[PDB]
Amino acid sequence: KSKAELQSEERKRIDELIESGKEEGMKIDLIDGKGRGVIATKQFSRGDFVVEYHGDLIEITDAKKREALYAQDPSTGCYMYYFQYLSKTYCVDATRETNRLGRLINHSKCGNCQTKLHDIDGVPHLILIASRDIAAGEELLFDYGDRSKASIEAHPWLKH
């Protein structure tokens, strides 16, 4: 197959999985020092779609409104995922508890998933792709990407 053909076939697999919301090969576990995490129950191969980071897709005005409200309640966790799309700031706000697993995946700078922006006919999606082969039983991890001094002071696990 040509690159274009392989890319088309990959886009097709990804679009189908985004559509179905199917989240196979994963389960929730308690991970020491992290709260809940998501662990592989099957081997994933490098390049495989893992999961969508699924939640409320919102723009910047609403994101700030929600942040200011979440900041007032210390029991509320951190599930807001910011990105740039077509020169604007967007956020997948996964604060609401649902059965979707992307929102539960923990942080490492040296993890096994990489987030990508995936556009379907003008609708942006954040998806996690395996950055290497992932063993059954190991925790899914990606780089949260917040390197700010303000965050790292309060959340030192962001440093590694």
Binding site: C78, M80, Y81, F83, L117, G145, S148, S151, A154, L158
Partner: peptide
Amino acid sequence: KRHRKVLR
């Protein structure tokens, strides 16, 4: 003190 998740 909150942190974010941010695409890079």
